[PDB]
């Protein structure tokens, strides 16, 4: 496996988005992963609709702005036969009527693949060979809310009880040794103004810090 990976530099990742006051990070994590797999498949980067997931995936077990899961979103896109673009089904950060339009669909999946729970090396192999990976993490801390740069490490983090979906777009290390100061490159959905241009470096190979490898998955396109 490569010493570092950053899918943003290969065209797989859309600009950072903002869920605003809606508990839809699970939908942004899911569209981010699907954006990367559709790009690997077709060569075209197309922003996908979180609102389509918020409004339409209640049958699969999501609850819109009240929370949800990336795996349930990939199940909806499979059962539904498609997912609309961000442009055609815009984000408004509130629960609304399902307005899925098949003629506006620009993505499909047949289900999803799960990374072995708790295994950071399995997650590293998925990030290096597949593309961006959906993951859940413990983001319930003011240190995360006010994160600005460097490798994020929080003593009070949980690897088991998670509360926020995000997207791992790569991994790397600080300094000249490719071990030591390793980190996961994570895309958030709190806007470009949050953190480091919308991203956060989370400590890597430090006992599954904040649960990044506890519930990771990616769509099969």
């Amino acid at each position: 496996l490569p010493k570092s990976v950053d899918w943003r530099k290969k065209g797989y990742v859309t600009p950072v988005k903002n869920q605003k006051q809606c508990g839809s990070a699970w939908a942004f994590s899911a569209t981010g992963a699907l954006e990367g797999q559709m790009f690997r498949k077709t060569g075209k980067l197309v922003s996908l609709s979180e609102q389509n997931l918020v409004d339409c995936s209640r049958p699969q077990g999501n609850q819109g702005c009240n929370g949800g899961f990336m795996a349930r979103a990939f199940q909806y896109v499979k059962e539904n036969g498609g997912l609309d673009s961000e442009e055609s089904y815009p984000y408004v950060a509130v629960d609304e009527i399902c307005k899925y339009r098949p003629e506006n669909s620009v993505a499909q999946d047949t289900g999803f693949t799960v990374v072995a729970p708790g295994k950071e090396k399995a997650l590293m192999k998925a990030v290096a060979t597949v593309g961006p990976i959906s993951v859940a993490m413990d983001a319930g801390h003011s240190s995360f809310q006010f994160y600005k740069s460097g490798i994020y490490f929080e003593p009070d983090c949980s690897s088991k009880n998670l509360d926020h979906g995000v997207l791992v777009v790569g991994y790397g290390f600080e300094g000249a040794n490719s071990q030591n100061s390793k980190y996961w490159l994570v895309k958030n959905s709190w806007g470009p103004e949050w953190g480091s241009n919308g991203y956060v470096k989370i400590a890597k190979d430090k006992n599954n810090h904040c649960g990044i490898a506890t519930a990771a998955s990616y769509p099969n396109v």
Partner: peptide, 4 residues
Amino acid sequence: VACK
């Protein structure tokens, strides 16, 4: 649900 869970992730928010």
